[PDB]
CSV table of C-alpha atoms and ligand atoms in Angstrom, one decimal:
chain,number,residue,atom,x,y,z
O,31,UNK,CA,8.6,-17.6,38.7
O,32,UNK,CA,11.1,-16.8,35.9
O,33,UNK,CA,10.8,-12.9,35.5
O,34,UNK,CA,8.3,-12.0,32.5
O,35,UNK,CA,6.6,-15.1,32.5
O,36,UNK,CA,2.7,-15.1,31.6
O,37,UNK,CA,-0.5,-16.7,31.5
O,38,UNK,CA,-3.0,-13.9,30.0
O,39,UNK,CA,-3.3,-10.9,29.2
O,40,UNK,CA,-6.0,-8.3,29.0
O,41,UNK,CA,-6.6,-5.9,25.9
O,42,UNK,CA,-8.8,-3.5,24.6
O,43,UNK,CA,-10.2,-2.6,21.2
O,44,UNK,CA,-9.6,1.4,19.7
O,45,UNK,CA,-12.7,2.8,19.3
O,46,UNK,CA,-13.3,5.2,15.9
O,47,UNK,CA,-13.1,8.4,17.9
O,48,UNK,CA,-9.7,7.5,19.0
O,49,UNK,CA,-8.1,9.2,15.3
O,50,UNK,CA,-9.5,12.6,16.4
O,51,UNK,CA,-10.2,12.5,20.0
O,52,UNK,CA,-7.2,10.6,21.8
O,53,UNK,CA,-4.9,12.5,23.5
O,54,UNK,CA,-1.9,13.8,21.6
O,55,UNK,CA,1.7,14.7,22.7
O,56,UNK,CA,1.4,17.1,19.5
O,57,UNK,CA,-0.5,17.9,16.8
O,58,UNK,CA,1.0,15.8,14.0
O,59,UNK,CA,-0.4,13.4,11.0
O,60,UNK,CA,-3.5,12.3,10.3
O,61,UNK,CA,-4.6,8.7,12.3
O,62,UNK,CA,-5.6,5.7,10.0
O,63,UNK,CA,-8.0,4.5,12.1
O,64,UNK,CA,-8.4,1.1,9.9
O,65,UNK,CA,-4.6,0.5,9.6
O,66,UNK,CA,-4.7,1.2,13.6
O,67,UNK,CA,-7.1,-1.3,14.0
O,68,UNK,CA,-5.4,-3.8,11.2
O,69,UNK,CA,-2.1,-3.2,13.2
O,70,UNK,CA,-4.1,-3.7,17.1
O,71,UNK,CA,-5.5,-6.8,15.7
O,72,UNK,CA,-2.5,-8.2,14.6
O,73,UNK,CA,-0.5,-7.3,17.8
O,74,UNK,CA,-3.2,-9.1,19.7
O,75,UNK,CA,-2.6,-12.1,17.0
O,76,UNK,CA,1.0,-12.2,18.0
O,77,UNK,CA,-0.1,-12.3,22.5
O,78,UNK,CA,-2.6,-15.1,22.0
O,79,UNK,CA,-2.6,-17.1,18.7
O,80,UNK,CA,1.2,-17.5,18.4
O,81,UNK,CA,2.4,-17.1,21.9
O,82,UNK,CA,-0.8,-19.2,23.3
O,83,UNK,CA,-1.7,-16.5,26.3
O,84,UNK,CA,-5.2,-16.4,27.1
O,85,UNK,CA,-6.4,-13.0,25.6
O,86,UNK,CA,-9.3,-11.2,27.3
O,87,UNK,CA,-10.3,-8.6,24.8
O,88,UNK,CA,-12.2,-5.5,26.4
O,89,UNK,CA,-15.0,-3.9,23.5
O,90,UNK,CA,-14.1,-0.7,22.6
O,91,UNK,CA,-16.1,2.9,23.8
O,92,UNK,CA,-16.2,5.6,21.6
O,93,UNK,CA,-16.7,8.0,24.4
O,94,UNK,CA,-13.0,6.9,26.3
O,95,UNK,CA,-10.9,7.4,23.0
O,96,UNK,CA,-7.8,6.0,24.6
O,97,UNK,CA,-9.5,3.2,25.7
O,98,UNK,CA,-7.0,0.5,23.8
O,99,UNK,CA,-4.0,1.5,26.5
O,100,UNK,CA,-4.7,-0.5,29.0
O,101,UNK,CA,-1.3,0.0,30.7
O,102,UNK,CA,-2.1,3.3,31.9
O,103,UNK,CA,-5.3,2.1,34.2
O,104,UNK,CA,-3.6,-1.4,36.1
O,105,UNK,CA,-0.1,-2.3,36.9
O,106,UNK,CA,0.0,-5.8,37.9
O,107,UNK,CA,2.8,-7.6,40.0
O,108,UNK,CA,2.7,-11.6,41.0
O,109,UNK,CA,-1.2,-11.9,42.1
O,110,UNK,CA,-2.0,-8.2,43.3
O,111,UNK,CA,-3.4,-5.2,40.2
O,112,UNK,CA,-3.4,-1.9,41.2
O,113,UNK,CA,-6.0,-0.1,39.6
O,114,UNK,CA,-4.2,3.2,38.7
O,115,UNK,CA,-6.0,6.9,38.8
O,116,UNK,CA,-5.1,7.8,35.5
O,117,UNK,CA,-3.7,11.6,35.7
O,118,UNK,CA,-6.2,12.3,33.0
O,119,UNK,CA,-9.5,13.2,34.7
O,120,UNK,CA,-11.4,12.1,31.1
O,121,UNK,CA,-9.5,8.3,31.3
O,122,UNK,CA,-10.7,7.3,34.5
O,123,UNK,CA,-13.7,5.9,33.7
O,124,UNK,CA,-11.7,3.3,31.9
O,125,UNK,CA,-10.8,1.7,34.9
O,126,UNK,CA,-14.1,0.1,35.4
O,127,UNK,CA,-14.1,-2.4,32.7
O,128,UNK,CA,-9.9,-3.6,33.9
O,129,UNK,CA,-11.4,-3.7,37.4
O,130,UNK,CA,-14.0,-5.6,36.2
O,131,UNK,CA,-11.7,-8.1,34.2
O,132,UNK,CA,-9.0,-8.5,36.5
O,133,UNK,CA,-12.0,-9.4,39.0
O,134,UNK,CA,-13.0,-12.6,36.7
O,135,UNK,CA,-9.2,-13.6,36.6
O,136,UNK,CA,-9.3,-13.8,40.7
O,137,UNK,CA,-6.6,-10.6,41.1
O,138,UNK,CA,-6.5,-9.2,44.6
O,139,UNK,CA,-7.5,-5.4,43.8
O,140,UNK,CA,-6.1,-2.3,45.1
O,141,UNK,CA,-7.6,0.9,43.8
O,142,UNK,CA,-5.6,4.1,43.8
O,143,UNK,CA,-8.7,6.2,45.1
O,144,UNK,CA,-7.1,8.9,46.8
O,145,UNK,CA,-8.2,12.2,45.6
O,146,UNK,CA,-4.4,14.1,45.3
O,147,UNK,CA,-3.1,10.7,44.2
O,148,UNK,CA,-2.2,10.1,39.9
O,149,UNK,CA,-0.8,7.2,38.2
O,150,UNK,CA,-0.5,6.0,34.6
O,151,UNK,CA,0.6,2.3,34.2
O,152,UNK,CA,3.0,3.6,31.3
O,153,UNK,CA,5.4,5.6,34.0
O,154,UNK,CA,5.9,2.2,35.8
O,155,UNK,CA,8.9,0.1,34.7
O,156,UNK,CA,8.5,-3.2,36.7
O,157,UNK,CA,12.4,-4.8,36.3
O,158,UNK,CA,11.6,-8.0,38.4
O,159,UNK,CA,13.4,-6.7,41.3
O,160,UNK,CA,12.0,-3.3,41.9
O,161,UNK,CA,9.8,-0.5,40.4
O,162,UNK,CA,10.7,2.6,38.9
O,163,UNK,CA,7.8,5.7,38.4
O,164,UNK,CA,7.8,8.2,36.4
O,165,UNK,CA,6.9,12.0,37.8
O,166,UNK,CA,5.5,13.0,34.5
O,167,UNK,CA,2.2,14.9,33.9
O,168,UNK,CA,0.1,12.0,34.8
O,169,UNK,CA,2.0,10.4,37.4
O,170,UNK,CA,2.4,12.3,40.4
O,171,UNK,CA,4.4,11.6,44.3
O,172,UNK,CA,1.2,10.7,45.9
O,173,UNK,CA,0.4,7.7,43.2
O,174,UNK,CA,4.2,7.2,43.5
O,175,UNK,CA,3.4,6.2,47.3
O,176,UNK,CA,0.6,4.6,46.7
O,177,UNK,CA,2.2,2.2,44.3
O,178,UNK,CA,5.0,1.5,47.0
O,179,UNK,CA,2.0,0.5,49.2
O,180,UNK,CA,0.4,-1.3,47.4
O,181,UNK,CA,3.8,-3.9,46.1
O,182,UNK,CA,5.4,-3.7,49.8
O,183,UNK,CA,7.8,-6.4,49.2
O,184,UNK,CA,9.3,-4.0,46.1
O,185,UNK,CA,11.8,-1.2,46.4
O,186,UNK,CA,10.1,1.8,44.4
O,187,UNK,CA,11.8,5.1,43.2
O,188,UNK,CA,11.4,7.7,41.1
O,189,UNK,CA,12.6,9.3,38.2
O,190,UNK,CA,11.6,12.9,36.5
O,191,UNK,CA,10.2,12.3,33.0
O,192,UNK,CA,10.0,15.1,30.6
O,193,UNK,CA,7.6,16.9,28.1
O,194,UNK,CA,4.2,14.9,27.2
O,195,UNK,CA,6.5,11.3,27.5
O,196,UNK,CA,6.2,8.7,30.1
O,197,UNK,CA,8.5,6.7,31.1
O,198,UNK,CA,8.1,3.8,29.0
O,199,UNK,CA,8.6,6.3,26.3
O,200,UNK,CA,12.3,5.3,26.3
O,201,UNK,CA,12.6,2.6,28.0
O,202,UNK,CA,10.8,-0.6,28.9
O,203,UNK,CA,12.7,-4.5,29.8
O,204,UNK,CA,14.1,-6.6,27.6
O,205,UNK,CA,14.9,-9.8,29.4
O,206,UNK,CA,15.9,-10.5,32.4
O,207,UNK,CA,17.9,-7.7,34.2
O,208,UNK,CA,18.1,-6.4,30.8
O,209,UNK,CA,16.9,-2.6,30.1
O,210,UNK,CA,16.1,-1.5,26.8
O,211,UNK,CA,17.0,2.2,26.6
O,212,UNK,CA,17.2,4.6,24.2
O,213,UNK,CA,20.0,6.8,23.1
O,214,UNK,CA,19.0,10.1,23.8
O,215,UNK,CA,20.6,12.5,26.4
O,216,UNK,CA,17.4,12.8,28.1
O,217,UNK,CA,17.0,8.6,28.3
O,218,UNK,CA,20.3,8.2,29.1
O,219,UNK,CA,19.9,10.9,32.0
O,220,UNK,CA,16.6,9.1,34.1
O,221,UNK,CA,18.7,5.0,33.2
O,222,UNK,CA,21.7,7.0,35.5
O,223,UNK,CA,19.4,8.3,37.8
O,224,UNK,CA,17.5,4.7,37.8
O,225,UNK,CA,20.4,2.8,38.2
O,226,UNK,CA,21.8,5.3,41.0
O,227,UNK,CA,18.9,4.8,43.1
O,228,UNK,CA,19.2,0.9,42.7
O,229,UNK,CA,21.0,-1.5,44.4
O,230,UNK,CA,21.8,-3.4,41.4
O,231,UNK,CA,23.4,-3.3,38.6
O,232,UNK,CA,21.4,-4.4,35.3
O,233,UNK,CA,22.9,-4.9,32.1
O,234,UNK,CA,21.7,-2.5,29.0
O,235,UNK,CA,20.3,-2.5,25.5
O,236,UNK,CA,21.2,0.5,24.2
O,237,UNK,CA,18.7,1.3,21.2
O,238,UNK,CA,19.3,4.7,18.6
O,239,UNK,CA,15.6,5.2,18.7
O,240,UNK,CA,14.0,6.1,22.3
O,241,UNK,CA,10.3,5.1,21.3
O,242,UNK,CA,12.1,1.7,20.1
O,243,UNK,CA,13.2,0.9,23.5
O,244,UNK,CA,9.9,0.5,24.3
O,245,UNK,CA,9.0,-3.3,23.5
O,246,UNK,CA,7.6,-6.5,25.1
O,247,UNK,CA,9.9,-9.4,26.9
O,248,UNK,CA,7.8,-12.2,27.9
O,249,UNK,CA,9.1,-15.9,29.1
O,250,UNK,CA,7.1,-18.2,27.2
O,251,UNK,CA,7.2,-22.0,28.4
O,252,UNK,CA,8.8,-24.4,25.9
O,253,UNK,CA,10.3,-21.2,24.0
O,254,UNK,CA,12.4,-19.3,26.2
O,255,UNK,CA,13.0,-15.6,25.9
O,256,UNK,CA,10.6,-14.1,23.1
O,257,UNK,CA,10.6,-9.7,22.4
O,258,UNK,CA,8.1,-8.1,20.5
O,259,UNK,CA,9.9,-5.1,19.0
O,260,UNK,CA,9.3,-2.5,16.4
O,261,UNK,CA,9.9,-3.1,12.8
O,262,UNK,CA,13.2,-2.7,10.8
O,263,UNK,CA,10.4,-0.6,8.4
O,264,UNK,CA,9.3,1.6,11.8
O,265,UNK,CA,13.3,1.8,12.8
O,266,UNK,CA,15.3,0.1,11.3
O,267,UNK,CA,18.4,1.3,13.2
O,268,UNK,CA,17.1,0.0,16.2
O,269,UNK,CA,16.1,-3.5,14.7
O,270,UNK,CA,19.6,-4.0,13.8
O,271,UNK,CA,20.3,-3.6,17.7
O,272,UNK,CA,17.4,-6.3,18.2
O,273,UNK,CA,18.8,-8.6,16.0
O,274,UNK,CA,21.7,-9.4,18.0
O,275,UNK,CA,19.6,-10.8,20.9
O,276,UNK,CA,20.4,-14.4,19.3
O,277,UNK,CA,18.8,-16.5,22.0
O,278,UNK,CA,15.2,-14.3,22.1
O,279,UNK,CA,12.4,-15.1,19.6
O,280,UNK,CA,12.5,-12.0,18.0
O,281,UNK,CA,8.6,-10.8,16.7
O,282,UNK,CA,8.8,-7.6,15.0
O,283,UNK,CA,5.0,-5.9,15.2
O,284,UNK,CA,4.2,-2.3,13.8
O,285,UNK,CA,2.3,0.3,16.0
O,286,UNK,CA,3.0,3.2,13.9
O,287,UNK,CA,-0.5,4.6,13.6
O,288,UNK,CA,-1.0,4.5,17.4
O,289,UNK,CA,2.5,5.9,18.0
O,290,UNK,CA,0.6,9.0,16.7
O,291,UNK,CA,-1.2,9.4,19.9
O,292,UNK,CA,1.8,8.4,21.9
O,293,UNK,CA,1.1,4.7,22.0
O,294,UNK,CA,3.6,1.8,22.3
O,295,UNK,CA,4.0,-2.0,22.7
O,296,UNK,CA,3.4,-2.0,26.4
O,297,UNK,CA,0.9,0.3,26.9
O,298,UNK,CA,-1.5,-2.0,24.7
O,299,UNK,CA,-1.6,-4.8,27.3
O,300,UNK,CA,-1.9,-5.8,30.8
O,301,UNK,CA,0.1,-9.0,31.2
O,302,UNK,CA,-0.5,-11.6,33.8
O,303,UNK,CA,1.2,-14.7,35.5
O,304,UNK,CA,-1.6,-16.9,37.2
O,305,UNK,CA,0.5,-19.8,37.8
P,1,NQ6,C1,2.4,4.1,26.3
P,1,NQ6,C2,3.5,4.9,26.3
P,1,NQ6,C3,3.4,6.2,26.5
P,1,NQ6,N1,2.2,6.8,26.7
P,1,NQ6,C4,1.0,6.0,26.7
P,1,NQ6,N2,-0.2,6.6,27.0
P,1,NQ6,C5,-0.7,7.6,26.3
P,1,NQ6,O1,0.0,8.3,25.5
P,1,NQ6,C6,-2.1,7.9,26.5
P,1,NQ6,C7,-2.6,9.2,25.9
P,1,NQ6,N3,-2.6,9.2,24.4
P,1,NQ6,C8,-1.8,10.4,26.5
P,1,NQ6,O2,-1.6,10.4,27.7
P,1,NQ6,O3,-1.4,11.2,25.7
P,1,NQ6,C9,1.1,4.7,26.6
């Protein structure tokens, strides 16, 4: 019941088209498809060889190019996934596979079909006591609503998110009651507005690199607090910050290839507590 515990998690491989045909915040470097594969492997590695979680690994499909972030089409919360109606028209076929998968691990599923309604999984911060969503350009009010729906017993509010970011961009948990955030005035102006609209107060990680904030807290049983962050080669300022979380198991993993196409930690798994 400990907040980030889980049992599985669900994953999917990059296809080859995702170096050219993957959504882009902005046209920037060339994609290594094989390091971004080498680097997905490994991050998979780290979720179910070393941590023991049961992976379920979804094949890739060349024609869904952003296929591997999985966040974007399910959030999940205790027993119930939403499947989420991705605010890119081209994504939502990936939501029949996740559908499908979350089926076979006995989810209750709620599918955001409404027609006015968007949602990416990546604009949801889930803190353990509430949810706050992102209006972005994939996440609209409507999905917003629906999401509040759907996880009744959960306060939900909202927070602008700028640009081509969502917001998990610059921000994502760190343990429990514990935000990760980064250190820009744009971060720092959605955590005020989060923690306005909240009814508690939760302590900070302040990190100087906003797409470092966005890493992996999971409750592992017989190891305690474990993070998954980026890599004192990938930000090293921001490691340093890491590194004074002395009683998590600190595992740093590189995503810089996918960060090319706007992908972090989070958005490459769905993580699951079936107790
Ligand atoms: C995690 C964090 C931020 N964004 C995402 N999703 C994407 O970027 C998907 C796609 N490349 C896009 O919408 O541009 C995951």
């Amino acid at each position: 019941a400990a907040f980030g515990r889980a049992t599985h998690a669900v994953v999917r491989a990059l296809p080859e088209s995702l170096g050219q045909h993957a959504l882009r915040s902005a046209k920037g470097e060339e994609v290594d498809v094989a390091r971004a594969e080498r680097q997905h492997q490994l991050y998979v590695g780290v979720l179910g060889s070393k941590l023991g979680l049961q992976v379920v690994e979804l094949p890739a499909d060349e024609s869904l190019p952003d296929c591997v972030f999985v966040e974007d089409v399910a959030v999940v919360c205790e027993e119930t996934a939403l499947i989420t109606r991705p605010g890119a028209p081209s994504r939502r076929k990936e939501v029949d596979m996740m559908k499908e998968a979350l089926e076979k691990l006995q989810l209750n599923i709620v599918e955001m079909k409404d027609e006015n309604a968007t949602l990416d999984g990546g604009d949801v911060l889930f803190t353990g006591r509430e949810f706050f969503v992102g209006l972005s350009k994939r996440t609209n009010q409507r999905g917003a609503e629906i999401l509040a729906d759907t996880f009744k017993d959960y306060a939900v509010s909202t927070v602008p998110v700028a640009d081509g970011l969502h917001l998990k961009s610059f921000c994502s948990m760190a343990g429990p009651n514990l935000i990760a955030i980064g250190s820009s005035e744009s971060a720092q102006k959605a955590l005020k507005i989060m923690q306005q609209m909240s009814d508690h107060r939760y302590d900070k990680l302040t990190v100087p690199d906003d797409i470092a904030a966005n890493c992996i807290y999971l409750n592992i049983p017989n190891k305690g607090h474990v993070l998954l962050h980026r890599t004192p080669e990938e930000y090293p300022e921001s490691a340093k910050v890491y590194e004074k979380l002395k009683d998590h198991m600190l595992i740093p993993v590189s995503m810089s290839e996918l960060e090319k196409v706007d992908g972090l930690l989070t958005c490459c798994s769905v993580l699951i507590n079936k107790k």
